[PDB]
Design a protein around this nucleic acid. Structure first.
Ligand SMILES: Nc1nc2c(ncn2[C@@H]2O[C@H](COP(=O)(O)OP(=O)(O)NP(=O)(O)O)[C@@H](O)[C@H]2O)c(=O)[nH]1
Ligand SMILES: [Mg+2]
Ligand SMILES: [Mg+2]
Ligand SMILES: [Zn+2]
Lengths: 134, 104, 38, 176, 419, 122
RNA sequence: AGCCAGGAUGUUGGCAAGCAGCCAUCAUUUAAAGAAAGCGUAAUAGCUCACUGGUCGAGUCGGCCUGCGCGGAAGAU
RNA sequence: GAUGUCGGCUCAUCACAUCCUGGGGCUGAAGUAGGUCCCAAGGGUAUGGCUGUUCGCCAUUUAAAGUGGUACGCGAGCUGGGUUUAGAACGUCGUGAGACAGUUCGGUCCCUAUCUGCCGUGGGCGCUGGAGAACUGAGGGGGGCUGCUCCUAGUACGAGA
């Protein structure tokens, strides 16, 4: 069993998409109909990997997953690349408003007693990429 | 198959060339009286002796010899004869002891 | 095996065992780690 | 040490005779005998066995533990047999039992035949399996080891005779 | 690393001339401090000194005035010529081959390099056994009288030959070791490319840039000793072994070339040679000639070659490109080291260089093709990936025929698209 | 009974007229090549414009000897000269097409069937 | 030391998924989990170490100083 | 108040740090073929061209063409090509006589074995009354090498080769 990233809205692009998950044995013509209708409300271009629990007889069923967080940071930064080593060169620090907007993506499916503890979890990737807070 | 024991033909005093298949030295190219001689017979003074059991000249033949695993060609009761493949030790008219082959 | 005067545990699966007056290293993971003193 | 302290609860229907150092145990499956080391005292004081050292012996405790383990195996074996599993992995590898003789086909140009010991029996539920049953743990182990000696498992494909419990490490062949 | 008087002669009549700038480069790489550089012109060498009597007296006067320690000729000179120069001037004399051997002796850090350099020195010294000055004098005697039985010159020749054979035997042991290391890859269908060429060609830094593995590189002549092999990615055949190599110089000593038989086994058996050439060197044709000469000497000129012109950044207003033969096979490539220009085109030329397949298959199956993912991505890759209606997935693939055959044997091969 | 340094005639049309045996193949210290035994030869005389040429080193098979062969009933077949048939080094098949003069049944082996087939006698 | 159980969230961290290499190397719910110890995988899946508890009832762990021993230890009548 | 030198021939003998053949661990050991390490000294262990050669190069072999000790084994066993006499010549050095760890041509190798040893073969006495045979066997010696082809099987293994 193998898994790879899938483009939600694109059908028949040649480089990236084909064996993303339909080659596992999932009927893509229905999966990326139902899930594509679901992601039509989701913003443009958010690769969202779901957990796979499917069969190999043209039947399938997928569980819900929240959209990513790492992809959304680079919108306001104005750069679409990455640094070799953060904490020395940065791609422009972002605001706490943007950080909490990204945080709200992971707020609906968390079972923590206190929701403020997720701040450290979200800013871990912020520090590991170079988005140091003010 | 049988094994045949007998006294081999006696050659008397035999030199090393005949007795031990020693190679003769050069017949020419300066050789002085040393054509069938045994050659060297030891090292220099570290053993300082001739070792026991060394191949040198002496009596050859006239000794007990056994030849093993000879095929029985014909066994003749009426004429009291046994024909055995190959040569067996000794001269004509000499005593032979014929046993079944131990190795076979 | 490798015969050398210095025999040591090369990983966490190695075990020192003295067998016939000879110290040996037996490894249950890597057969390359078989050693005897000699 | 600790194993020596732990006593051997001898079950019912098994007859124990401590003929000095010689110790004999009879049961439903059969009679097994042992000659313990001189530095072991084996004693009856209940419906059980007790092991200890004889004074004047450095080994003492070491021996004691070994005797406890051996006698535990003896009583277990006479009560219920000791069983061993073997499996033949191969394209045309096969086992068969002709009565105290195990014929093996293992790719050799001749057929292998192992004559079993006295107190061991064999069965073949499948051509690729051998079941050994016996009384002596040592003997059944040795017979299984001899059966494995013909074709022990090779690493590339796991070919040959393997204990059913063994994990056989498999390594990939040379690259490409 | 001492004081030296340098000597060069313009033998313009024949091809036995040498480059003074390269000679000075070798001297500075050795670390010697030059106090003077004498020039001469001759038709053919003088047998007695290798120079005229007048020029020999001039070098003696230069040594006397400058207080120099050694005299470095840029030429091969005989033991008798060395002896006569030594007699005129008390300072020691070093041949060009002696200078090269000294440079390699300083540079050698590995066991193999030390073995090869000491073999070369032993042969070069076995050539120079002309003076048997010893304190035991001639052993007089007669028929049936005690004595050594042989001359001291013959005894010394015996001893030198025996120890040379010993160094040699350890060298075939090293060849066996390296041959095992080679044979690890040959049983695999390994592509192996060796990049070779004149010194300071930038080939070591080309290796460093291609492989992302640090290897020494600088402006020092004969910087690298012994090879280094590294895995590289190529589009067609996947995994390939790039090998760096010790550089060459005009007129390598034959004893040195013989000594480096163990090291040169990579270039002997390379599936490709990348002949890396410094385009900015005005003696580029001479470098081609020297490299081809040593390749012929080691008998490795029949292997497929591809020329790679480095240092185009020193050429004003030039862009990299690939020159192709009449058979449409790339025979020459241009590129730069630091700027990285020409590197992808070098990769593309390498893809084209070795291959035996151009057909591309297209595959599709029902939901039984996760194994197909694993196998394809295992052998090489998926060339062109997409899905289609009814959940079907249409792959396009191009991998070697050996990969095709092994995949077909491993799989049920019910796809009826791949042979 | 063929040794090193012994001259042999050629009983084939490969071109060589006379060849010299330079190694008796088989085991170590082996002395003699009889009929049916492979030898290593050097060509000493050859017709111009032939398949082989003077100085060539290759293999041959002894097909005739003066010493002769012994038959199981005890008879001997002797010849007036020693002759051989040239063979390729790495394939051991004869170079030529025709075989001249008689041969013996000692060449009745799976490898010399091609010699026996084109031999004029035996 | 033995004997059962869990190793997850962002996340496939970023420039190949913990496990080519490089930089951040910090949280997390929590009894606990190193942006991951080798294996292994094209690489994931997988393997399971570190990581924490249950049951198991007399000692156990590992550094120091020393007596005496062991291996290192193959020659030519 | 002499222990004949190098190489060759003849004859060898031990060691083992094993060259081949046997046993095995690991392998970057898929198979064939190898590498490396450990045990193993029973047996075996080239022929030629060149050169005085040992070596070395080369040709062609072999299962292999092992490494060392034995007065660099072996001239009261052979040889005398080389080194190390007296004749002569070339180059070089020296005024010369001469000289040269340069080269060249030529150029006497004795010993009847007392003792130890060793290979063979006898006489004497002894072995407890003499004699003739046939034995047991304490102990000792010899011998122990290996190639190629076919079958198992084009099977196992291997994408094939
Ligand atoms: N201007 C310029 N300099 C270059 C270029 N490539 C290499 N160099 C310089 O030239 C030198 C190359 O040295 P090196 O990489 O060791 O090349 P090499 O031929 O492998 N060295 P060697 O063979 O002697 O071991 C270094 O000084 C490097 O800086 C190039 O494209 N342009
Ligand atoms: Mg005479
Ligand atoms: Mg370099
Ligand atoms: Zn280990």
């Amino acid at each position: 069993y193998v898994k790879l990233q899938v483009a939600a809205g694109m059908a028949n692009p040649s480089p990236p998409v084909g064996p993303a998950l339909g080659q596992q044995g999932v009927n893509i013509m229905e999966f990326c109909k139902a899930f594509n209708a679901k992601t039509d409300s989701i913003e443009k271009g958010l690769p969202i990997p779901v957990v796979i629990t499917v069969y190999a007889d043209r039947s399938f069923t997928f569980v819900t997953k929240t959209p990513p967080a790492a992809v959304l940071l680079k919108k306001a930064a104005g750069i679409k690349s990455g640094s070799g080593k953060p904490n020395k060169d940065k791609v422009g620090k972002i605001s706490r408003a943007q950080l909490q907007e990204i945080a709200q993506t992971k707020a609906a499916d968390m079972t923590g007693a206190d929701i403020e503890a997720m701040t450290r979890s979200i800013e871990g990737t912020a520090r590991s990429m170079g988005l140091v807070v003010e | 198959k049988v094994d045949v024991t007998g006294t081999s033909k006696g050659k008397g005093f035999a030199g090393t060339v005949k007795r031990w298949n020693f190679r003769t030295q050069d017949a020419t190219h300066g050789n002085s009286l040393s054509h069938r001689v045994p050659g060297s017979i030891g090292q220099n003074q570290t053993p300082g002796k001739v070792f026991k059991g060394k191949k040198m000249a002496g009596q050859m033949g006239n000794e007990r010899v056994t030849v093993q695993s000879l095929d029985v060609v014909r066994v003749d009761a009426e004429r009291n004869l046994l024909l055995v493949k190959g040569a067996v030790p000794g001269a004509t008219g000499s005593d032979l002891i014929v046993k079944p082959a131990v190795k076979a | 095996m490798k015969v050398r005067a210095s025999v040591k545990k090369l990983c966490r699966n190695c075990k020192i065992v003295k067998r016939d007056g000879v110290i040996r290293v037996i490894c249950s993971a890597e057969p390359k780690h078989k050693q005897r003193q000699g | 040490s600790r194993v020596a302290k732990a006593p051997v609860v001898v079950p019912a229907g098994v007859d124990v005779k401590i003929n000095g150092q010689v110790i004999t145990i009879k049961g439903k499956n059969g009679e097994l005998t042992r000659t313990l080391n001189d530095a072991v005292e084996v004693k009856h004081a209940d419906n059980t066995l007790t092991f200890g050292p004889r004074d004047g012996y450095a080994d003492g405790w070491a021996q004691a533990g070994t005797a406890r383990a051996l006698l535990n195996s003896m009583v277990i074996g006479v009560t219920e047999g000791f069983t061993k599993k073997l499996q033949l992995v191969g394209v045309g590898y096969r086992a068969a039992v002709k009565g105290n003789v195990i014929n093996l086909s293992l790719g050799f140009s001749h057929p292998v035949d192992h004559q079993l010991p006295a107190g061991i029996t064999a069965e073949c539920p499948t051509q690729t399996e051998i079941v050994l049953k016996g009384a002596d743990k040592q003997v059944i182990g040795q017979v299984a080891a001899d059966l494995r000696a013909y074709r022990r498992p090779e690493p590339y494909k796991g070919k040959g005779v393997r204990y059913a419990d063994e994990v056989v490490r498999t390594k990939e062949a040379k690259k490409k | 690393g001492e004081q030296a008087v340098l000597v060069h002669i313009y033998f313009a009549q024949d091809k036995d001339m040498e480059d003074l700038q390269e000679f000075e480069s070798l001297v500075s790489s050795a670390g010697v401090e030059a106090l003077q550089v004498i020039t001469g012109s001759r038709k053919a060498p003088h047998p007695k000194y290798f120079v005229g009597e007048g020029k020999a007296v001039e070098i003696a006067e230069a040594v006397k005035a400058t207080g120099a320690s050694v005299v470095l000729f840029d030429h091969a000179l005989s033991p008798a010529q060395e002896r006569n120069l030594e007699r005129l001037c008390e300072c020691r004399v070093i041949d060009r081959t002696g200078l090269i051997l000294d440079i390699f002796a300083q540079r050698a850090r590995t066991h193999e390099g030390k073995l090869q350099v000491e073999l070369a020195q032993l042969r070069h010294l076995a050539t120079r056994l002309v003076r048997g000055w010893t304190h035991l004098e001639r052993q007089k005697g007669g028929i049936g009288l005690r004595g050594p039985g042989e001359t001291q010159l013959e005894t010394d020749r015996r001893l030198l030959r025996n120890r040379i054979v010993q160094i040699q035997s350890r060298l075939e042991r090293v060849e066996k070791q390296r041959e095992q290391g080679r044979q690890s890859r040959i049983k695999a269908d390994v592509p192996t490319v060796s990049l070779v060429g004149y010194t300071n060609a930038g080939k070591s830094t080309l290796f460093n840039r291609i492989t992302e593995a640090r290897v020494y590189a600088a402006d020092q002549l004969f910087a690298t000793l012994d090879p280094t092999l590294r895995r590289i990615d190529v589009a067609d055949v996947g995994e390939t072994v790039l090998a760096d190599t010790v550089g060459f110089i005009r007129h390598l000593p034959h004893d040195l070339v013989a000594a480096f038989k163990a090291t040169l086994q990579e270039t002997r058996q390379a599936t490709l040679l990348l002949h890396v050439i410094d385009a900015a060197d005005v003696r580029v044709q001479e470098n081609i000639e020297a490299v081809n000469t040593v390749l012929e000497e080691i008998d490795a000129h029949e292997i497929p070659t591809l020329l790679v012109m480095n240092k185009i950044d020193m050429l004003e207003d030039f862009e990299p490109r690939i020159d192709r033969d009449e058979e449409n096979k790339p025979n020459r490539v241009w590129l730069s080291a630091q700027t990285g220009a020409g590197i992808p085109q070098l990769f593309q030329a390498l893809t084209e260089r070795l291959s035996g397949e151009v057909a591309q298959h297209t595959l599709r199956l029902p939901p039984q093709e996760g194994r197909l993912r694993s196998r394809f991505y295992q052998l090489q890759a998926i060339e062109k990936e997409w899905m289609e209606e009814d959940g079907s997935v249409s792959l396009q693939v191009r991998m070697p025929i050996v990969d095709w055959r092994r995949l077909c044997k491993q799989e049920p091969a019910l796809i009826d698209y791949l042979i | 009974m063929i040794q090193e340094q012994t001259m042999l005639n050629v009983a084939d049309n490969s071109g060589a007229r006379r060849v010299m045996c330079i190694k008796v193949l088989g085991g170590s210290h082996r002395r003699y090549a009889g009929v049916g035994d492979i030898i290593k030869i050097t060509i000493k005389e050859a017709i111009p414009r032939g398949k082989v040429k003077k100085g060539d080193v290759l293999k041959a098979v002894v097909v005739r000897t003066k010493k002769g062969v012994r038959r199981p009933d005890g008879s001997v077949i002797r010849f007036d000269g020693n002759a051989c048939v040239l063979l390729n080094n790495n394939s051991e098949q004869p170079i030529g097409t025709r075989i001249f003069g008689p041969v013996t049944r000692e060449l009745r082996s799976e490898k010399f069937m091609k010699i026996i087939s084109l031999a004029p006698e035996v």
